[PDB]
Symmetry: C3
Subunit: 203 residues, 3 copies
């Protein structure tokens, strides 16, 4: 019924996180807002396009862009208090990651019963916004470099596909998908999990 709470925590947490980056980058108030809006809602917009769902929910359904704008605006005005809440924002981010991977995997599944589309599009909904943020910041996106965000959303999206394939009801599929994303994200944060690199000595 009210999975909106997890979504709204995600929109707020992702907007704050994007807005903080924008400030640290030196962007003016519009950039802070655009950075926050993209981090929280750009994944969803990309997936709508990939799936042919026009116009995109996050530009149409008033409370989502309203929330992201206010959350970004509040991070700007009160940036002194917001930038010192390190551990709580990390956990809220993990909540948004799990809500967004589940949601987008759900939307992809309703378009095709296809494991590749569902895993990729679920993962784009969760981490696509931060990729936009990082390209707008003139940086190599974080998910290509370090941490363990996108991998967890990949595994979460795949869990949703398997549940639905095994005829698990939708809402149960969402919760389990959300909860496994959240477990793997917390293991990764605390254990400092990383994917392997190639170490090449330079001549």
């Amino acid at each position: 019924i009210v999975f909106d709470i997890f979504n709204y925590i995600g929109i707020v947490a992702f907007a704050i996180s994007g807005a903080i980056k924008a400030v640290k980058k030196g962007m003016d108030l519009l950039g802070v807002l655009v950075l926050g809006f993209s981090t929280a809602l750009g994944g969803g917009i990309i997936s709508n396009l990939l799936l042919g769902k026009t116009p995109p929910t996050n530009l149409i359904y008033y409370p989502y862009p309203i929330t992201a704008f206010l959350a970004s605006l509040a991070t700007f005005v009160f940036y002194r208090i917001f930038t010192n809440v390190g551990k709580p924002l990390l956990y809220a981010d993990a909540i948004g990651l799990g809500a967004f991977a589940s949601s987008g995997a759900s939307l992809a599944y309703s378009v095709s019963n296809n494991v590749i589309l569902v895993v990729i599009v679920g993962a784009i909904t969760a981490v696509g916004g931060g990729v936009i943020r990082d390209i707008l910041s003139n940086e190599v996106p974080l998910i290509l470099t370090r941490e363990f965000y996108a991998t967890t959303a990949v595994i979460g999206s795949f869990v949703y596909f398997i549940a639905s394939d095994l005829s698990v009801p939708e809402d149960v599929a969402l919760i389990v998908s959300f909860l496994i994303t959240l477990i793997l994200r917390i293991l990764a944060m605390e254990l400092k999990w990383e994917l392997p690199r190639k170490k090449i000595e330079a001549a």
Copy 2:
């Protein structure tokens, strides 16, 4: 009837401006052309996708891409004369900003009577092309950093929505929207208007 003049001034002015950036970046003739084409027509292509309008006008309606290609090509061949016409190109740019914000707000409105979609999509039509240009240039897009472009196109798009909502006829809605964008852009250029930043002392 012939609002095409404002559109065509915009395509030419935006192509020249994008083409100039490409030259200053060191791009070869193809990049100059791509930079000019994107600055003038990429906003429109992005909005077509957001609105589900396929294939995009700016890749279909011959005179628009023809104009942008020739304008970019002419900036390359005659880059000595074109790069010293500073103030006139700024004002032509302001004309394109007002024509493009109006047009795209119009197209968005005909898809949904929705203030958020119309304001954002109108603004993407006007400044989306320059964002592409700047990402292709490996830079943080200008609108996130300085000046007052995107804000003026936001206000212009919102004026178009309010006019249409109050039952103002379409063509009148376009002109008033275009003219207010143009007023705010000129105030901003001459008064050097900027949005606020956060100044954080580094330790």
Copy 3:
């Protein structure tokens, strides 16, 4: 009948080439995979969106993303042997360039009998993936700067349009388009062809 061989050589060659860049950039295993996947399949995804073809083939038709993932994964595990096969990968790349320009020009043509759409969208299918790769790498895309990739795919796409316009049958149109792309690419590699730049002395 089996033009799949040329396509599959392209997917493998473009995935290896993208995966190599990712390693040289310092990306972790996910980034290597994303870099390879984008270089081989992102052009096609962009063209599907431009043409309204949803969901995109390269996220739906299992062997294409499977091939790109395995090709990228194999470049990572065995990066010692793969990075010393310089001349053969260049020629395989030229094969993918010709297959991808032909394919996408074909898809664009079936949507509109329009020379501008077909040339641009054909060219995006062939070089669009490498543009994504380069933006993800925080670089100015190669095609704006040097070499002769995109121009050859432009000429190849235009040859496909002219053939089809002159009532040449489809499969014959594909082969001739593919072969002329491949001729121009090889001339360009060996003769070191480049487009002109503007040389401006700095004061």
